[PDB]
Amino acid sequence: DVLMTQTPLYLPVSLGDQASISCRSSQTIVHNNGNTYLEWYLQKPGQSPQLLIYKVSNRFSGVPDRFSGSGSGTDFTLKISRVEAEDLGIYYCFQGSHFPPTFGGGTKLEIKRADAAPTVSIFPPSSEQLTSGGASVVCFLNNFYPKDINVKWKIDGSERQNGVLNSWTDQDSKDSTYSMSSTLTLTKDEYERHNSYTCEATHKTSTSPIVKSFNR
Amino acid sequence: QIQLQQSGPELKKPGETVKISCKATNYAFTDYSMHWVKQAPGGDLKYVGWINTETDEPTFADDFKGRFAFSLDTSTSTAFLQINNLKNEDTATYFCVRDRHDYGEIFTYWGQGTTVTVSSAKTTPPSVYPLAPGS
Amino acid sequence: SMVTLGCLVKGYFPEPVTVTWNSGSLSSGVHTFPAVLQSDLYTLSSSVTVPSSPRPSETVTCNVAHPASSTKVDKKIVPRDC
């Protein structure tokens, strides 16, 4: 079982920039035939894997000159030279030398931009959900960049570790940013027992986390 | 012009059984064994196995060695992937692929994918709540 | 001054659910987030930061469509005040 390992997990660049994504093999991948079967696939959003390179360097029928496969043994590197607006997606190495054929980790090829802070907003539960009994306090941390960011909930000064389900936007299309929601869900009775609810956004664009809250 | 048109989505429930198709176009369907790959939501690109289109002899990767089944109809040129005792973990997107008579593997032509979804839930409509500013 | 309203679409199955805002007239600063599983049902949300001035003025409704239930439901946002 050859564990395919790729680097980096995420690779952001500008348009027209060169990218060099790399794959690593736990075991060599020269099949008996006398050839290494390193394969590079490109999966776009909600699509299937487009073979790009084969047998290490053989770019498939139609994939551009831009896409080049390198390598020998366990180490291989695919490399674009003028990133066009359609190369973005999750790149994947593969291998058909052994059994079972393993699929690399996936290197997400994205856009790079000016780091920007989030626009935190905090909303208490609504009246109706509140009758229903549940209580969901939501926090949008929209439009920040880079994607790394961490929101902490704090009920009555105290940090609330559980009850939160998060959900991430992909690179915003209009501007290459990212956005995200963090929802804490107690029951009417839990929510009821408290006063203050804070949602601290901590983005690398600052030292002191961005804070918002509300009482009842 | 070789195409590998698959089946539409399937909202199954834990335990139920499901069979999935993969119609093969423009090539000798019995001269290239079909392959099935699994892709768990958000990534996880795993390999299910293959079935020899000639003998029908299936080959499963250690882990899909339990409830998965491979079968085919030659008088249509359609492969099938079935799953039994259906678990939650099974939800994901399954693709059928094939090579180009290279002995070592090169999954060249893939299926568009057919998602299989597992959930106890029976079609239930969303409750809507307005997020008016509170602060 | 910008006003971010939101819309909590919760407890639906299966997918998907089209969240629109102002019958599709707010195509600016609107994010419908990816659904998850609170357990066995899907939960999702959506945001729209509109200008401060017009929101309170009027016309700010959340539009969620859920094809399976053949259900269309939309809710206008109200201040709640106190």
| Domain architecture of chain B: domains with CATH | 1-135 (2.60.40.10)
Nearest CA in chain C to B120: C40
Interface list for chain A against chain B, based on CB atoms closer than 8 Å:
31, 33, 35, 37, 39, 41, 43, 47-49, 51, 54-55, 60, 90, 92, 94, 96-97, 99-103, 106, 121-126, 128-129, 132, 136, 138, 212-214
Q: In B26-126, where do the E strands start and end?
A: 34-39, 45-51, 58-60, 68-73, 78-83, 92-98, 109-110, 114-118
Q: Nearest Cβ partner of C62 from B120, B125, B130? A: B130
Pick the CATH number of A1-113 from 2.40.420.20, 1.10.340.30, 2.60.40.10, 1.20.950.20: 2.60.40.10
CATH 2.60.40.10 spans which residues of chain A?
1-113, 114-216
N residues, chain A: 216
Contact B18, B12 (CB under 8 A): yes
- Neighbouring-strand partners of residue B71: B80
What 3-state DSSP class applies to A130?
Answer: helix
Fold of A114-216: Immunoglobulin-like (2.60.40)
Residues of B within 8 A of A55 (CB-CB) are 102, 104, 106
Of C43, C34, C30, nearest in space to C3 by CA: C30
Q: Solved how?
A: X-ray
Q: Cβ separation of C36 and A167 shorter than 8 Å? A: yes
Q: What is the CATH number of the domain that holds C45?
A: 2.60.40.10
Tell me how many domains chain C contains: 1
DSSP code string of C12-56: EBSS--EEEEGGGT--SSEEEPPP--SSSSEEEEEEEEEETTHHH
Contact A209, A159 (CB under 8 A): no
Contact B28, B54 (CB under 8 A): no
Give residue for tokens 């659904």: C35
Distance of CA B71 to the CA centre of its chain: 13
Q: In units of Å, what resolution does this entry have? A: 3.0
As a whole number of angstroms, the distance between CA C17 and CA C11 comes to 11
Note down the domain range covering C80: 1-82
A112 C-beta neighbours (distance < 10 Å), count: 14
| Pair of tokens at residue C81 | 């005040």
What 3-state DSSP class applies to C57?
Answer: helix
Q: Cβ separation of A103 and B45 shorter than 8 Å? A: yes
CA distance C34 to chain A (A): 6
CA distances from B88 to A68, B15, B40, B56, B60 (A): 39, 9, 11, 28, 20
A84 C-beta neighbours (distance < 10 Å), count: 11
Phi/psi of residue A132, nearest 5 degrees = -40, -25
Q: Cβ separation of C11 and B126 shorter than 8 Å? A: yes
Task: Write down which chains contact chain A via at least 3 CB pairs under 8 A.
Answer: B, C
CA distance A182 to chain C (A): 10
Contact C80, C66 (CB under 8 A): no
Of B55, B39, B37, B56, nearest in space to B47 by CA: B37
